[PDB]
Amino acid sequence: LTSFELVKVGSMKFVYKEEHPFEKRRSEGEKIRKKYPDRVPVIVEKAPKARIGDLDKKKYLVPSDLTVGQFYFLIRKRIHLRAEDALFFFVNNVIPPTSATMGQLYQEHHEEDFFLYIAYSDE
Amino acid sequence: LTSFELVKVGSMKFVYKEEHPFEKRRSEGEKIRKKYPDRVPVIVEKAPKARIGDLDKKKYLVPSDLTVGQFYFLIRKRIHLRAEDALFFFVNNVIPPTSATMGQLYQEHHEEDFFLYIAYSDE
Amino acid sequence: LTSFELVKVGSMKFVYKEEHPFEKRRSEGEKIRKKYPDRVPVIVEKAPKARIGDLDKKKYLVPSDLTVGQFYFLIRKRIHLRAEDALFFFVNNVIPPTSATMGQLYQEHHEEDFFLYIAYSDE
């Protein structure tokens, strides 16, 4: 292995889910989806061990046609990330395509409380 | 909604299409596609309300195998965008995948004047 | 063509393959894949004519679930690329999607010496 660079990169826990019982999360998610049917509610939290800054607001109401890439730029600005700093999103531990819409990701991956959960990391 | 960040992001009008009649655009597009069959002609214009700079040249003749991402970097340089500034492309209001080729996008979306139309924005 | 910007962008040769015979490369690749089945061995080299810097280490042992995009950021750091500088990866002359995993790319494109070959360029 001496001639190789060994690259080192599931333990995600959303504090929103730790702090608030499922039934209360679902009551909120259902109210939002009924009132704003063209938008999707998203919880965005930092992955453990990520040395990147913590995001100030975790709850977003996003137009369904907004892409991952457009949302990346919004989140980058909120964290005040420098251009040289990396940011990756994970939905159920998988990085989505940058051109996927938030509506598509919500339809495919929202949990039964009607939220889409996104983790972010710098690696 | 107080605990949510409400994210706010079809009205695109290409001045190339406003200024030049369809028949003249098509005559030009057909001549280009006949003379340069391995290239695609592309019109690139800024979306309304985008506070980003206006692009100096709007007409591009692009190798069919060039990707969206390679073209992004070219356009970023022409606008003199800083690395922290965002740039998104839209074809018929949809952001294409970064690894799609311009030839694929042309085949799927060129208009009957034989041009591919790309709008760009900072959001 | 006067009103058009003519955009100008297969000749790739991996020095790893020039310097080391196939049988020796394969012996190494097979040993690595047996010992580290959840990782993939990757050779990363600069494309000809690319004015970008040369990469210091060419051999990487990568987790199979790491994405192209995560690997991009690693390679960008090793080259000391500024944020305004472009970097593109090519596997058999094709830029892969940023959300593809290295395991997927390896399964689809590894050569019979059990290495995945990636070229990089600034255009």
Residue numbers in the entry:
A (entry chain A), B (entry chain A), C (entry chain A): -13 to -5, -1 to 112
Published text:
Initiation of macroautophagy/autophagy is mediated by the ULK1 (unc-51 like autophagy activating kinase 1) protein kinase complex and the autophagy-specific class III phosphatidylinositol 3-kinase complex I (PtdIns3K-C1). The latter contains PIK3C3/VPS34, PIK3R4/VPS15, BECN1/Beclin 1 and ATG14 and phosphorylates phosphatidylinositol to generate phosphatidylinositol 3-phosphate (PtdIns3P). Here, we show that PIK3C3, BECN1 and ATG14 contain functional LIR motifs and interact with the Atg8-family proteins with a preference for GABARAP and GABARAPL1. Two hydrophobic pockets, HP1 and HP2, in the Ubl domain of Atg8 ensure binding of the side chains of the φ and η residues of the core LIR.
